[PDB]
Each structure stands twice: as structure tokens, then as C-alpha cells.
């Protein structure tokens, strides 16, 4: 059966090169492939076709930092001068008789990007939401790298664990991370405390924001 084998992840430093690999099953070792890129949150886009003879043809608009090559049953995508936007999932794909097949995808991490401390904004429940007899506190965590944080909520200094939802950090258009945490309360709970706080820990340092009814 026609199989394209990709390992699930690869890693290299900002500004370095990386060579992603796709291996064809032995009965199809002379096939051409296509490489596709899927940046976080987006649909796929075509990068290039890599031919059996080692030649490759990039899609229109694809940077020349992307190149392709071949060795036996192996098909390669080499990305040079790695930039933050190259963090993406890369899929190889081929053409058989009456069938097309994708590899499992390779997630590329680009290491060593500039460190950035989070900017935290804490929003109280809006008057409109309180008039709808609901209350959400929204803790916005912006512009940080690397992309891992922990969040702790408190009510008048006592920890609050119930009703907390926190998103996995997502890359912003400026290539730094953002994340959000929500604390769900009743209006009566909101109005009963002197204040609520959101504490964000990033790389061993904490940033705290407080709001009051």
C-alpha cells in the first residue's frame, strides 16, 4: 500500500536550517510528492512539488528559503534562515492510481526566539453582562515568549479554582503569544468581594492585576 511516513515533529533554532523528511513506501519509491504548509489557525497552502529526479518547483509566492530534494525513497523539504512564521505543520502528499495520500504531518518548532514578558489586562464584568444577570472576569495575557504561562485567580486574596477556563497560548500576528483566562461568577458573588485578582506566572516571574466592583 502507498504510505508516506513523516515523524511528528522537528526542531531547530531561529536563523538555522532544518531538513524535514518524508519517506515513500518501497513499491512507490520513484513517486513525486508535494509539500504543504499549515500555519497555526490557517488552512493549508501548497509549497512545492519535488520530482523523482531531485528537481523541485515552488508554488507562486513561496519564498526561496524553501527548497526540495530527493534521495532514494526519501523526499526532503529544506527551510533555510528559519523565521518565527515557519512554525507550522508540514504535510507531504503524493498521487497514486485512483488515490491520493498524505503523510501524518510534521510540526516544526523554531527555538530561541526573543524572550518577552506578558502584558496583563483584567476586565471586570461589563454592565451589559451584569444586566443579563451573569458575570465573567476576563484576564487577557498578551505579547509573551516562550508560550507557556500559568494563571491563578484570587477573591480577596483567597484562591479561586472553580469556574476557571484558560486557553492554550496562541501565536499572535506579531509572532508573540497571547492567552486568555475566564473566571465565571454570579453577579452576587462579584459584588460581595472587595476585589478579584489574576496572577500570571511566566518564566518564574509573576504579574498581578486586580479589579474591584
Amino acid at each position: 500500500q502507498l504510505v508516506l511516513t513523516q515523524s511528528p515533529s522537528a526542531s531547530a533554532s531561529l536563523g538555522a536550517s532544518v531538513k524535514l523528511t518524508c519517506t515513500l513506501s518501497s513499491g512507490h519509491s520513484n513517486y513525486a510528492i508535494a509539500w504543504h504548509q499549515q500555519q497555526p489557525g490557517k488552512g493549508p497552502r501548497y509549497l512545492m512539488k519535488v520530482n523523482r529526479d531531485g528537481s523541485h518547483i515552488r508554488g507562486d509566492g513561496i519564498p526561496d528559503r524553501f527548497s526540495g530534494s530527493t534521495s532514494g525513497a526519501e523526499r526532503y523539504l529544506t527551510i533555510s534562515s528559519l523565521q518565527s512564521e515557519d512554525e507550522a505543520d508540514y504535510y507531504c502528499q503524493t498521487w497514486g492510481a485512483g488515490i491520493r495520500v498524505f503523510g501524518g504531518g510534521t510540526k516544526l518548532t523554531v527555538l530561541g526566539q526573543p524572550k518577552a514578558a506578558p502584558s496583563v489586562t483584567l476586565f471586570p464584568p461589563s454592565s451589559e453582562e451584569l444586566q443579563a444577570n451573569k458575570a465573567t472576569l476576563v484576564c487577557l495575557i498578551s505579547d509573551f515568549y516562550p508560550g507557556a504561562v500559568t494563571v491563578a485567580w484570587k477573591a480577596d486574596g483567597s484562591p479561586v479554582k472553580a469556574g476557571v477556563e484558560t486557553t492554550t497560548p496562541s501565536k499572535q500576528s506579531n509572532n508573540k503569544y497571547a492567552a486568555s483566562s475566564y473566571l465565571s461568577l454570579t453577579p452576587e458573588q462579584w459584588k460581595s468581594h472587595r476585589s478579584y485578582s489574576c496572577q500570571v506566572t511566566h518564566e518564574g516571574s509573576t504579574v498581578e492585576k486586580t479589579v474591584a466592583p
Binding site: 504543504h36 493549508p44 501548497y46 512539488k49 489586562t121 476586565f123 461589563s126 465573567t136 499572535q172 475566564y182
Partner: protein
């Protein structure tokens, strides 16, 4: 300038038939194979099948008993029908332009243009439009909180699309109710707060909901 656009219901019940269309603009569907592909949330790409308007159609061996792909030359459209759906069919569905066949019968393999994708959720739950609340504000953050909608997705733009810089729309959170919520935020200069207005435009196509909300100081 060939572009592909998928469309179809965003919500179907288990055992129903999912029906999608792929409309091609900027070029004809003639001569090419056109493929359907899907991606369950957080998973890889799966080829569903393809069609050439005069040559052949075929589908993935694992889906073939449920897959029917067709074409409509007058509408410049491809279609996918997937019968007897279950939660395993919840996915973003794409079409793509595939191999070109010359009328000599020779060909050049390709897979070079993708559509934008359309999200389909298989569930017996009913559609629900969102409630939108402002997040009121030398930089400041402001935003909109988009609560309690189903299914995904919602789109959020700012100032009717005129504001695209400090904008970030977050991944949705799945509530224990089975509904989704998200927020969208913008970082603006503090000096603009007393003069520039900021209005989020929330679109939820599955419920045909459209809401504008001003985030005012």
C-alpha cells in the same frame, strides 16, 4: 487568480447526510481533477476523494461506501455527499485543485490550490447564536466577549474590517453547557481612546447572527 470556496451546513445530526459544495472562481473546472480533504480538529489531513468532470471519480477506500462526489459544469462547482455521519466526521472540509489531464490523455500531477475550508460539526444539539458583551478599555486593551454559541466558528472583525493590527481573536472555550465562548481583543494607542471608536463585528453563520458592539471607555 483561481480561487476555491467551500460551503455547506455547519451542523448535521448523527446519521444524516453531509452535503458540501466547492465553487471555483477565476477559472474553469474543466481539465482538472478536484480533490476533497478533511481535517478533524487537532489532527492530520485525510484525502476523501476526487472528481474530473469527464474522466473518473474515486474515493478513499475507508470512506468509499459513504462518499459520493459530483460536478456541475454550469455552476463551476464540485460537490461532496457523505452519508450516515457520526462524530468521527466532525472536521474542517477542504477542496483543492489536483492533476491536470491534457486531451491527449497525458497529465501533470499537481495539488496546488486549496480552498479556505468549511467547518462541520456532527451533533444533535441545536444551533445557538452568541451573546456579545464589550470589554471596555501609552497603550490600552479593549475587546469583545462572545458567549454561548454553537457550533463553531464565529468570526470577529473590528471597525468593519478597517482595523487589522493589534487584533487577536482567541480560541474558543467549550463550556460544560456544550456551548462555546471566545474573546477578541485589540491593543490601541491610549491617545486614540477619546476619539477613535472601536466596534467589534461578530458573525455566526450557522445561526445567521450578526452583532456589532462598541467597546467604549
Amino acid at each position: 487568480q483561481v480561487q476555491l470556496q467551500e460551503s455547506g451546513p455547519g451542523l448535521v445530526k448523527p446519521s444524516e447526510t453531509l452535503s458540501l459544495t466547492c465553487t471555483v472562481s477565476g477559472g474553469s473546472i474543466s481539465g482538472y481533477y478536484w480533490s476533497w480533504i478533511r481535517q478533524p480538529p487537532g489532527k492530520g489531513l485525510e484525502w476523501i476523494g476526487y472528481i474530473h468532470y469527464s474522466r473518473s471519480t474515486n474515493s478513499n477506500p475507508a470512506l468509499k461506501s459513504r462518499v459520493t462526489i459530483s460536478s456541475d459544469t454550469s455552476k463551476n462547482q464540485l460537490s461532496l455527499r457523505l452519508s450516515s455521519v457520526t462524530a468521527a466526521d466532525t472536521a474542517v472540509y477542504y477542496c483543492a485543485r489536483d492533476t491536470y489531464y491534457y486531451d491527449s490523455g497525458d497529465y501533470e500531477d499537481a495539488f496546488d490550490i486549496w480552498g479556505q475550508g468549511t467547518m462541520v460539526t456532527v451533533s444533535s444539539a441545536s444551533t445557538k447564536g452568541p451573546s456579545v458583551f464589550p470589554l471596555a478599555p501609552g497603550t490600552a486593551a479593549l475587546g469583545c466577549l462572545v458567549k454561548d454559541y454553537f457550533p463553531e466558528p464565529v468570526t470577529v472583525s473590528w471597525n468593519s474590517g478597517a482595523l487589522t493590527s493589534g487584533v487577536h481573536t482567541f480560541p474558543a472555550v467549550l463550556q460544560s453547557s456544550g456551548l462555546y465562548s471566545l474573546s477578541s481583543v485589540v491593543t490601541v494607542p491610549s491617545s486614540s481612546l477619546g476619539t477613535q471608536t472601536y466596534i467589534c463585528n461578530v458573525n455566526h453563520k450557522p445561526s445567521n447572527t450578526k452583532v456589532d458592539k462598541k467597546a467604549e471607555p
